């Protein structure tokens, strides 16, 4: 008798589908100003690829998605 499969069969593919340091001078310290070069944090911007009344409706749903 038997109830369960085998392994050789159950392997096939169609089936499966340091250290630290405490500086009292600089332990609890954090940067106060950070250098950025991105105009996004700076300023909000829409999604590049867009479309107007018909061309590539996929881009229309992308607009609806990324612009909110």
């Amino acid at each position: 008798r038997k109830t369960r499969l085998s392994k050789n069969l159950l392997r096939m593919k169609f089936m499966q589908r340091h250290w630290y340091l405490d500086l009292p001078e600089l332990k609890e310290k954090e940067s106060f100003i950070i250098e950025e070069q991105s105009f996004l944090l700076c300023e909000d911007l829409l999604y590049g690829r867009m479309s107007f009344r018909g061309f590539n409706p996929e881009v229309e749903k992308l607009m609806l998605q990324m612009n909110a």
Partner: protein, 237 residues
């Protein structure tokens, strides 16, 4: 060296140091600024600008709306590119910067060794950077991190690719732009804005495409006369 708050809408010139009020509140140095001790050195002429987050703890953010043409590889920016060659697994694409960026044959949406993408030399792309730094060549990718190309990949064909200033883009992509809204009423279209001053456009016919490209490359200072002139032309196409 005075009143960062009083020159948030004035023209700053390089060399100028400006200092900010306070124990303190973390802030961020924009792209055209630089830090000297506890002061902010200016590195590019510009109409200074500020912003604050909806919260009250974030502090603020400062920058300069500098106009220019040359691009610099930055991280997390959507960019048009032009495949310049292919070396084995990775193919090199131009961006308009110091050196050419690199792609990987398995970065496109749904690709593996047994499924390679259709990229031919001269083909143009809409990707984004994941390593943009001054010390290493920039690598880009045409797929969000989750694993879906949310509009990325090869552009296509049958369009016009031209080039404009970067501030022009930084303005057009604003949610309160008038030109790109009014254009959605005359004749249809579909266009890619690349933050490297490079723009791609497509419409049904070609006369329209040309009129559109001219508008865009001029819309920084168009006069109402020329404005309605090209609008009437589009209405007559």
């Amino acid at each position: 060296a005075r009143a960062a708050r009083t020159v948030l809408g004035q023209v700053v010139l390089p060399g100028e140091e400006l200092l900010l009020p306070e124990s303190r509140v973390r802030v961020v140095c924009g792209p055209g600024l630089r830090r000297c001790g506890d002061r902010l050195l200016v590195t590019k002429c510009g109409r200074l600008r500020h912003k604050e987050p909806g919260s009250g703890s974030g502090g603020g953010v400062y920058w300069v709306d500098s106009q220019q043409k040359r691009y610099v590889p930055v991280k997390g920016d959507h960019v048009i590119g032009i495949v310049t060659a292919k070396s084995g697994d990775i193919f090199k694409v131009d961006v308009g910067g110091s050196e050419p960026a690199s792609l990987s044959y398995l970065s496109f949406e749904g690709a593996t060794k047994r499924n390679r993408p259709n990229v031919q030399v001269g083909d143009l792309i809409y990707g984004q950077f994941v390593v943009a730094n001054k010390d290493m060549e920039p690598e880009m990718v045409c797929i969000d991190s989750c694993g879906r190309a949310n509009g990325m990949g090869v552009i296509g064909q049958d369009g016009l690719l031209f080039k404009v200033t970067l501030g022009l883009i930084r303005k057009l992509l604003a949610p309160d732009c008038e030109i790109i809204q009014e254009v959605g009423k005359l004749h249809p279209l579909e266009i890619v804005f690349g933050m490297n001053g490079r723009i791609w456009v497509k419409a049904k016919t070609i006369q329209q495409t040309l009129i559109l490209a001219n508008i865009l490359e001029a819309c920084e200072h168009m006069t109402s006369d020329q404005r309605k002139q090209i609008f009437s032309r589009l209405a007559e196409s």
